[model samples]
Target: LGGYMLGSAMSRPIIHFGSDYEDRYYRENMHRYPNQVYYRPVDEYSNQNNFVHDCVNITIKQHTVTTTTKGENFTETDVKMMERVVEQMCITQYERESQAYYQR
Candidate 1:
């Protein structure tokens, strides 16, 4: 059982930024935008070095621009969905850790 559990743990996947179109944009814009760009993943599926990756960014364009978003613009549904995602991640991590501890 110990060996089986260890093997299972070793088989688990890891995440990192990769060379997808998102990575291309991240690399290309890193110098042009400097502080404006974050070339990393906001979730587990992305962020693989030399592997395909994806990203999201917030930016301001030309034409006398500044950026602003009202809290009201975020609907209750959107907020709830985000909260649910966070909660689920916490729950999942807790379970994984607990199971590993018991296996030890």
Candidate 2:
């Protein structure tokens, strides 16, 4: 179906790429370098800030928006209120993590 030359020998799928590379391809065959500490970067949490910001903006502006199936409507004021709550939640979580980090 695709652009590759098809044949009966090729009909059986080549499940593993064992000898394709000079180095071993499998995870079991792999090795990590010495003194390598895999630390999750702080910037991973940066997206959370952006998410909250976008959520606040979206919900506040979705004033009269409603779901067709559920027939539910949300007030703009409630979303605006929730925005404050989410911000506080994020702040508290950061503070808590910071305190725990220092203690450890």
Candidate 3:
């Protein structure tokens, strides 16, 4: 039973930012990667509880200036910077941890 439970735990499928994600932001922005998780509730009547973690960030174009080009204001440079931040900080760290887990 113990071995079965452990195997069950390890067998669950996983998802991460870079490989599983696309440019539309479903996996990178919307997905959550928990750091310190808690299940026990502080109240007696509570059925379930969770303390999940999420990424922190500044706004994509908070300091960027937009210029009208062909009747459209474009901030492509700001968007590119955001993508680089997500790739380097977010995806890089997440994938590193995930690989370490699988190795152990």
Best by lDDT: 2
Name the top TM-score candidate. Answer: 2
TM-score ranking, best first:
2, 1, 3
Assess candidate 3 and give its lDDT: 0.30
Q: What does candidate 1's lDDT look like per residue over 5-104, in tens digits? A: 1101121122124537544544443332212211222234332332111111111121012212322233343333333333333334345554665576
Candidate 3 Cα outliers beyond 4 Å, as residue runs: 1-74
* TM-scores vs. true structure, each candidate: 0.28, 0.34, 0.27
- Compared with the true structure, what per-residue lDDT tens digits does model 3 show for residues 1-104? 11110001121113333543344443334322222111222233222111111221222222222223235343453355343443334333444444665577
Q: Put down candidate 2 lDDT per residue, 3-71, tens digits, no spaces.
A: 211111111111233355422332332221111101122333434465445434443333323333436
Worst 10 residues of 1 by lDDT: 1-10
Better candidate by TM-score, 1 or 2: 2
CA error at residue 82 for candidate 2, angstroms: 1.0
